[PDB]
Amino acid sequence: AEALKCYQHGKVVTCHRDMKFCYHNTGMPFRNLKLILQGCSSSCSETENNKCCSTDRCN
Fold first, then answer.
1. Per DSSP, which regions of 3-49 are E strands?
2. Which residue positions does UniProt flag as site: Important residue for inhibition of rat ASIC1a?
3. CA 13 → CA 17, 29, 38, distances in Å?
4. Domains of the chain: total
5. Domain that holds residue 45
C-alpha cells in the first residue's frame, strides 16, 4: 500500500503508514491570533474548525 499523502502548509507530506486522514484545523484562540494545524492523523472528527478527509492531498 502506498501511504496517504497530505498537504501541510504548502508542502506535501507522506503520512505514517497508519494514518487514515488528512486534516485541516483553524482556530482563533484570541481575537488577534489564528492557529492553523494541518497534516496527517490516525483519527479525525468533523467539527466547525476541524475538516477531515481520507484521499491524497485533499486539504
1. 5-8, 11-14, 21-30, 33-41
2. 30-31, 36-37
3. 12, 26, 10
4. 1
5. 1-59
